[PDB]
Amino acid sequence: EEDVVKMSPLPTVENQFTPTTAWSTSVGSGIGNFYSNLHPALADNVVYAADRAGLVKALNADDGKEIWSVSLAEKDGWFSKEPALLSGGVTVSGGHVYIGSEKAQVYALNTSDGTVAWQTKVAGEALSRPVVSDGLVLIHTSNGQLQALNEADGAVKWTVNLDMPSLSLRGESAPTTAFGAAVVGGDNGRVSAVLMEQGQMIWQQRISQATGSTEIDRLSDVDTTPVVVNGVVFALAYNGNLTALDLRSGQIMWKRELGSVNDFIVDGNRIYLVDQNDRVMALTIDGGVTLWTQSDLLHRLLTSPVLYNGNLVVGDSEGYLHWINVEDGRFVAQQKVDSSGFQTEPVAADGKLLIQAKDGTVYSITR
Amino acid sequence: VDCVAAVVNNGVVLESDVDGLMQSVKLNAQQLPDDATLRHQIMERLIMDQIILQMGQKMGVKISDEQLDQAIANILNYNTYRNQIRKEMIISEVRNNEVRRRITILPQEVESLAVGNQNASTELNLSHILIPLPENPTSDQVNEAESQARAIVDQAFGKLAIAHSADQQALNGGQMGWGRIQELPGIFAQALSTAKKGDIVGPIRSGVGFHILKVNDLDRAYRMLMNRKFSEEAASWMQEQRASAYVKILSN
Amino acid sequence: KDIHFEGLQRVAVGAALLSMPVRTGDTVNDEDISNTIRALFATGNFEDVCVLRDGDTLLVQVKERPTIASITFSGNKSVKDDMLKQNLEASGVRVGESLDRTTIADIEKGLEDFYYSVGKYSASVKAVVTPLPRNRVDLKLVFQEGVSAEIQQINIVGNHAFTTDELISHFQLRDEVPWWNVVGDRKYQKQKLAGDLETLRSYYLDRGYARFNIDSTQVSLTPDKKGIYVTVNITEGDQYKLSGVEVSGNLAGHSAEIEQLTKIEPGELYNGTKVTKMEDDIKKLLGRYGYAYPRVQSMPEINDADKTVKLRVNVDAGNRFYVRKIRFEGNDTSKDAVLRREMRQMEGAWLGSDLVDQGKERLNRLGFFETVDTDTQRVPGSPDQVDVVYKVKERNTGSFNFGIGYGTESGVSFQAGVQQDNWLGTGYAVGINGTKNDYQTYAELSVTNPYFTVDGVSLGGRLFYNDFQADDADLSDYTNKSYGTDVTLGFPINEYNSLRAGLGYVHNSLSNMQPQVAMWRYLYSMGEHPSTSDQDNSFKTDDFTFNYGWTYNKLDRGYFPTDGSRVNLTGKVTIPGSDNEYYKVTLDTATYVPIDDDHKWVVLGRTRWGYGDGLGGKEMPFYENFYAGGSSTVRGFQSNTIGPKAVYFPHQASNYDPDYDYECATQDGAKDLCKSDDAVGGNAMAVASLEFITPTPFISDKYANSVRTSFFWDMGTVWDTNWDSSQYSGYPDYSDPSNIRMSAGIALQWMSPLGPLVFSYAQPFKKYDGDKAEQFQFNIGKT
Amino acid sequence: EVPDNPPNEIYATAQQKLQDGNWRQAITQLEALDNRYPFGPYSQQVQLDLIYAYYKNADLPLAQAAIDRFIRLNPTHPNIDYVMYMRGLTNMALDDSALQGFFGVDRSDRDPQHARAAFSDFSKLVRGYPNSQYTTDATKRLVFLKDRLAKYEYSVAEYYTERGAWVAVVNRVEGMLRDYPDTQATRDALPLMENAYRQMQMNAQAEKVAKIIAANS
Amino acid sequence: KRQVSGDEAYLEAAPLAELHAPAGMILPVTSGDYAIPVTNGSGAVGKALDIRPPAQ
Amino acid sequence: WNWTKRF
Amino acid sequence: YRPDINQGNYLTANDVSKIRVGMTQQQVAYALGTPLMSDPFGTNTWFYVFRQQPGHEGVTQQTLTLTFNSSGVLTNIDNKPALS
Ligand SMILES: [Mg+2]
């Protein structure tokens, strides 16, 4: 069995610089082939990486030395082992490390030592990023419930049920917060904004042109984190439309025939995204006019793009990091980073580009 | 004496119509380049018109005659002229019908009430050259497209607006008439910020292609923004229909 | 003036004439010819046309659309070619008409559609249009089917009581399939998911969770459409009790017996299996009373306060239906009697749903049919008469088996054969089989009629030829070439039981016999007095044996049993008029007692008894002696090493070589009897084995049940009651059963892709002289 | 493999193969001609040749499909009697589908639904076309099919006598006397019904069956 | 598998003779859905009939 | 290993 | 050994008591159901046979003969509770 197309040949380009790994720190079995949103974070100078087995390491961002390490797995005797199944990406905002798990448990650990500050059972697999906002931790469970939990107490403040299709795509849209309004992408194509206090429905708008095929192929999931810029919410469904909508009313500002489940950057007057066909597209914000398109990485299983030193960075399921130019989209640089591959999104914070591979070995890149 | 240039969908573009419209633009023209490039551009334009015609002559109804007569009287073989005007006013109507559904206009900040917006100072007479690109112009399309665009901007305009353009105004020369600041695509706004009498604007990266502008002359905002969104969306959707069609070139 | 076409090779000329307004004797100008060509392409008759300039009148060139003459499919590994040819047919383009290039992409997406439906969410297709003269083209679609969408993980949410691995172990959908284990496939199906949801519900209702509910079932695709994640978001309740059971509805006067079925002890955990068994018991009771469709709805009234369950068993005994006639459809090979003798529901009797289900299950157990469906059609013009029509899909019943295995007991076992289990559709099973061990070469030809009597008595004959090399079996060297026939009647006296009784003639040819005390004692007692020299001896016997047997099989599971007992008492006594005059009784037993409700911990009591002696004036043949040791009898010992040891006489071997000693050869320097360590077996054996089966310690619980770990302790002693302890006093008394060898060890069993692998490491802590203590025993796929 | 030759030569070659006795080439040529030129000249003769070749090549299911296509496409045809007779022949060939060889098994107690279909087809043919050239051949085949169906019901009755299902035996022989009153199998099954009545101690009907046997022995 | 059915060599079936109802009783009604019509013709049987499809 | 093939 | 051999109608032993002379065929056919065996030779002589042969227990048969007339009205009830 061979894929639909031979995975796009490695685009040979002359790198304008020498991309190197500043430091490498392995994490045991690193989530693995399993699809997850689990990616490192960075609060001030500490990289908080996690693992599917339940191993969470806080490392020094400058040199990759273990500040501390904790195991969240709950073994029972010597008959069965229970890995924590961490899937929610690490989010560290208020001095706590928030990690979701597929056991419907969200853990807040202390950045000081790694002890479990609290742990709360939620509706389903916390596949989304446990975003932190307004003293609340918002997660989007795989069951379809958007749950907001107390930042310190840990008890669920509220839970809002979202419609779930018969079939969906792995992963849930991490909430985005703006002006006390939380915007999430339901798996049925409905982008939904609710309040940040008890979560009553502000509005819900369908953004997916899908369901026309009437099959199990045109899944209309919105698995990307919406981005709020200038009071406009940009969302990107799967097999749907890249839609800019009014935050207050929910009416569509504009729409493009683009579908993806990868997070996109919205900065200045530009939106950079990776298509469902792993096609790197940059569009305008005013009307969504596609400024440029890169199909040389077609069907290469790219990760969510990030902006590092004014240069887009994209992974792939081969351990290759492609530095794509911001302006014309031409491949500025290309680095062979790992052999297992890249699935989770990188993070570009504090001048550091951090990325986990499919074996979890955390790498810091310098441009 | 009447061959076929190409087949598109179930329709076919002939050689009689290609040569007839070439003679029409010849009589209209302005100076024009070598007739071979005009041949290729004319078959390209007729393929462009026929593919969108298939979208509308099987679904959309047909224009009336007396409103057509009023339009032509307001502004050779009479039968052929009436055939061409019936050929074009229906395609403009169906293009508008599709583009209106591909565009949304809110009474909110989409209306851009906050009417002055960016300064809208004076109407501008500007010309447009477009370099068509495939929905996936990566591999080498953009690379050669860049080379052609640099050659065009270095050379400049009467030749090139017909040579390798893609909009319906390719044969006319990209003329847009009077145009205000907000009645232009968003990519063109920054070029307009650097625009000047007789200035040549370099190619602008876009999914539609590379756009070259040259300024020739130096509820109200609803029509301005509608014009700019219509330009962007029509330019996009023409490329989408070009990619989503079966076109073959017949050397014969 | 006059149109002259040049094409129209395939399309009729009249179609072009009617599709082209300008014709012979018509006005000619550019506008008209343009209109005619536009209307000609309007119908799509011709792919390309042209008008060629000619001084004489008008000329027309025509190129019709290239007709497809054949459809070629390549690379469609996951689906049959004509399945996609039906897709091409349904689109509207097929062989016999033209090919449309526009329709090609629709074809491509159509093939994507059924690859999506079958489970290949990524399967690209490329069209290849090979030209052919006379305006023809052959499509050669290159299929490139991506990686199949396998289940990456099955997750359960809210299963605080039971681990996810334990619940998924019973699922037929598998997220982990180890290379060394056969636990299924990772392919995902809707029906499989529904069946596993029902399995999860059954598992939770069997543990007392009456309030268990599956809140939702999320099926998600990895964005690459290669991995499938199943999240069964459940809400388990508490471990409820069973306070009482009540029955209602029209019990039709059998209220007393139905209540007699519904005894429960209070304070016992709710069990969905027990509830369903009670419902089926009431159904069977009413069906035995003549009710065809005894509807039974056992609704639970759940007291959350006291956390108890009260079962309201509403019973509605429907009208009595009678089977006018039982009809069999699709039995083109098997005759009607073969299918009808497996029916428990009888034509002309009152219809019984349980009886019909039993008949369908028996037909499925025959193995002659791919699938067996039952339809209880209503007889027209009769309110309570039905026809129980059975639709069977006949199988290619004949098959040839090709097994290869390895083990310490028998070395390399090459098994082969061919058997037609439905010979001429008469129900007879004919079959030739063959086995080649390191020491035994068996060739069998068995023909059996499963129903020699309508009651179910089978009659089977068997022509067998066994070449047994005793030296290779870790015994005293002798080659026994036996051949004969058996005719055995099997009596199914009761279910879980089967007697058998038959007559068998066997001719044994013994050669290369090692001179030894036991074999020579037998030969002397058989009336022959040949010399102790001449290693290559020869003996021939023709012996007729009445064989009897009784097999009690209550094992709930055929593979890896957890509860029940399997006893096999097989005796063989020589009828008068045979060269040998002896009887030999053997008794196997394997009882499985589950000591836990989950049946993970099992106690296995395995016994292996045997006693045989002559009937006066004769002794038991030395080749019929029992053996112990090796795998499956006494682990930790060498194959057939437990028992009396051969006492070789001073004799001259056929071949001699220094430093080999040739088992006490005269050339080596032997003049007196010697104690040899090569075992010969004994006329009696007694073996017992206590085997504590535990869940595999270090393994994922998803396939823990697929690997049986056991701690075994085997006692076993083989003795020869005819041993002459008087004139053989220096040697150990081989007629002493008190020398009970014992071994203790650990064992692993699992169905690897190489067959059933059984490994074991055992230390014999109480072994005697001459017992080869083979610590490690194993057997790779004996099947 | 058949080249795309004009229909006349391909049809002539297929016919020559048909009298030559070599079938598979004839089927291939006929199906190639039919597929290349659907509903062309003398297409009905091509369909008849295809049906005959499929029947003679032991390819019964495709013969049935082709016959159904012909009968639904030509409800009023000059050679409709021929195609119904071919359908009956195909059904009868499905009846005697021995897995290995046609031996003393006689296939009487095998699946009779193909025999029932063949009997219905030939009955329709003879009732609708009593003057066709296949009329008396179809009548003889109906006689044989009636004998075979009654033999199947007799085998069922014999098995039920062995089992002791005397009610089933009585019902089966009553079904014989109704549907198949003039068959040797019915004459053989009458003693079975008498035995079933006697074993049930209903001598009031056993005597009637004995009288019937005596009057017809 | 069905080649021998090309020549089934039938016609050995005994002629169908209706049973006679003895005095005092009548045989059950035939309901002749399996009845043989009296239709007859030349129709040379025993492979003498040409099953070759008649071209028109 | 054990192989069996349905012919 | 041999399985359960059930044959004929299941006489409840209480439905048969409800049968009295003068009832039409419809009423009895409602009370006990259509008999498995009729009299195909003679008149409407319905035979309701409740026959049971268990697994080596001994065959027990209850015969119930209902002799009607041409008119369709019951005339005679020949009940044999056991196999003679
Ligand atoms: Mg999702």
Side-chain angles (χ1 to χ4, degrees), chain A residues 168-172 187 221 223:
Chain A
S168 65
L169 282 182
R170 194 50 166 185
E172 306 289 316
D187 272 318
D221 296 12
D223 287 325

Side-chain angles (χ1 to χ4, degrees), chain D residues 1-205:
Chain D
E1 179 269 320
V2 176
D4 195 0
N5 291 339
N8 71 358
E9 183 178 1
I10 295 284
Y11 169 56
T13 47
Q15 180 192 4
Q16 185 259 9
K17 284 322 320 183
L18 282 172
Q19 292 84 18
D20 190 277
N22 187 211
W23 300 116
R24 209 153 301 182
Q25 305 181 23
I27 296 89
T28 56
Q29 292 264 345
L30 291 166
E31 61 86 20
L33 194 154
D34 193 68
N35 197 357
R36 272 143 198 173
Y37 292 163
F39 296 120
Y42 51 88
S43 177
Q44 279 83 23
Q45 292 76 7
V46 176
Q47 272 275 35
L48 297 189
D49 299 320
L50 264 167
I51 281 163
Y52 164 79
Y54 273 141
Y55 159 69
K56 268 284 210 160
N57 202 47
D59 179 14
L60 308 177
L62 282 72
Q64 293 278 84
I67 288 155
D68 292 328
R69 284 146 70 218
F70 194 95
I71 198 52
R72 304 161 311 81
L73 263 58
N74 304 88
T76 55
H77 191 74
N79 286 345
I80 185 175
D81 53 342
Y82 168 81
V83 70
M84 321 195 98
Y85 175 72
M86 301 295 318
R87 182 179 178 180
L89 289 178
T90 302
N91 272 313
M92 201 175 308
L94 284 160
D95 186 3
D96 66 2
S97 58
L99 73 164
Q100 313 302 332
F102 293 97
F103 204 49
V105 286
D106 191 25
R107 291 199 50 79
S108 284
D109 50 358
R110 266 69 170 177
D111 199 14
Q113 72 176 93
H114 297 304
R116 279 183 220 285
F119 195 103
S120 75
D121 187 10
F122 283 170
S123 285
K124 202 170 306 311
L125 160 66
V126 296
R127 289 184 279 97
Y129 316 84
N131 54 357
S132 175
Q133 61 183 356
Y134 312 102
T135 292
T136 195
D137 186 27
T139 288
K140 306 302 293 317
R141 284 187 185 285
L142 290 173
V143 165
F144 168 71
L145 284 167
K146 205 180 181 181
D147 284 305
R148 179 253 186 272
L149 292 164
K151 270 184 287 190
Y152 168 81
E153 304 269 0
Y154 176 66
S155 70
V156 179
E158 193 183 39
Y159 159 74
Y160 276 139
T161 47
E162 275 191 353
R163 184 67 267 185
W166 307 124
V167 172
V169 177
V170 165
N171 273 4
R172 286 284 174 167
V173 187
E174 161 178 352
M176 311 265 268
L177 282 179
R178 273 196 332 268
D179 287 320
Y180 314 144
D182 51 359
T183 315
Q184 164 67 19
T186 295
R187 284 166 74 86
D188 287 337
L190 270 177
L192 260 53
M193 168 151 78
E194 179 181 359
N195 172 41
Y197 275 140
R198 287 203 186 285
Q199 292 280 332
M200 294 177 71
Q201 295 185 358
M202 294 182 286
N203 304 292
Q205 298 289 119

Side-chain angles (χ1 to χ4, degrees), chain C residues 491-656:
Chain C
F491 295 126
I493 58 169
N494 185 21
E495 191 274 330
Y496 323 111
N497 279 348
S498 81
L499 309 174
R500 55 183 156 278
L503 264 67
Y505 150 73
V506 57
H507 174 264
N508 307 274
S509 314
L510 298 159
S511 54
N512 299 346
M513 297 191 259
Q514 292 299 114
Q516 63 157 114
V517 168
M519 301 185 28
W520 280 118
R521 185 185 80 251
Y522 163 69
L523 293 182
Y524 269 71
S525 54
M526 291 265 288
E528 293 83 3
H529 279 201
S531 75
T532 61
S533 304
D534 299 348
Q535 176 63 42
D536 48 353
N537 310 81
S538 296
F539 193 28
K540 289 189 182 296
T541 62
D542 291 278
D543 173 48
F544 305 89
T545 81
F546 167 70
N547 306 307
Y548 53 98
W550 160 55
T551 308
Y552 159 89
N553 202 326
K554 194 83 151 293
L555 293 179
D556 55 351
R557 290 212 278 158
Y559 188 66
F560 286 166
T562 61
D563 199 354
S565 298
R566 187 207 149 276
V567 188
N568 184 16
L569 161 65
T570 289
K572 157 198 296 198
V573 62
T574 55
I575 52 174
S578 54
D579 213 338
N580 278 302
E581 298 285 326
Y582 74 95
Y583 74 97
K584 168 189 179 182
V585 175
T586 308
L587 188 137
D588 305 63
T589 296
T591 184
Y592 295 69
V593 190
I595 65 161
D596 69 322
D597 300 319
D598 204 12
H599 284 213
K600 302 289 286 302
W601 309 75
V602 178
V603 180
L604 182 153
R606 180 175 88 263
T607 78
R608 181 67 178 171
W609 304 85
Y611 194 12
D613 283 326
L615 309 173
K618 295 295 178 301
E619 282 178 355
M620 194 158 147
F622 53 82
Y623 49 84
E624 300 257 21
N625 290 120
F626 302 96
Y627 302 102
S631 58
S632 71
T633 55
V634 181
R635 278 158 279 182
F637 285 90
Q638 182 168 104
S639 186
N640 312 340
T641 197
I642 302 196
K645 308 305 186 154
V647 183
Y648 293 142
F649 281 157
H651 74 93
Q652 306 187 2
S654 305
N655 171 31
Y656 179 62

Side-chain angles (χ1 to χ4, degrees), chain C residues 29 71 154 245 301 337 376 386 420 502 619 775 777:
Chain C
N29 56 5
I71 297 96
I154 310 178
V245 181
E301 187 202 313
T376 313
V386 291
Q420 172 65 277
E619 282 178 355
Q775 288 276 337
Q777 300 278 332

Side-chain angles (χ1 to χ4, degrees), chain A residues 268-291:
Chain A
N269 205 353
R270 317 267 173 260
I271 295 165
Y272 315 94
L273 58 92
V274 162
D275 209 9
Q276 62 190 78
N277 316 286
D278 283 298
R279 180 184 290 125
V280 188
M281 293 177 71
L283 297 78
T284 52
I285 302 177
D286 58 353
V289 177
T290 295
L291 294 174

